[PDB]
Amino acid sequence: GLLDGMKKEFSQLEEKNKDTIHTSKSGGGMVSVSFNGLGELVDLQIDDSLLEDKEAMQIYLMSALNDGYKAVEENRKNLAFNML
């Protein structure tokens, strides 16, 4: 009943989640990514300057993406911790 009732409440935190957008940057702002509350990647932008250095570009891309996903996950976990 507990877990099922919580499952029912997690669905309420969906129409909220789906609209909420969080942006993470890296490489001095040369990479920007945005995730919605559902964890969907809804924006990705790379400064042309980074095309000159693929290896750095890939590192900054991973940094920004992991920060954004970390935020989605922390939100999932923290809302669950509080609910019960």
Residues in the interface with its own copies (CB under 8 A) total 40
Going through 21-83 in order, the beta strands assigned E by DSSP cover 21-26, 31-36, 41-46
Alpha carbons 32 and 43: distance in angstroms, whole number = 8
- Residue 8 lies near its own copies (rule: CB under 8 A): yes
**Side-chain half-sphere CA neighbours of 20 within 13 A:** 12
Among 18, 29, 45, 56, contact with its own copies (rule: CB under 8 A): 45
CB 23 within 8 A of CB 32: yes
Shortest Cβ 68–its own copies spacing (Å) = 9
> Which residues of this chain interact with its own copies, rule CB under 8 A?
1-11, 13-14, 17, 39-41, 44-46, 48, 51, 54, 57-58, 61-62, 65-66, 69, 73, 76-84
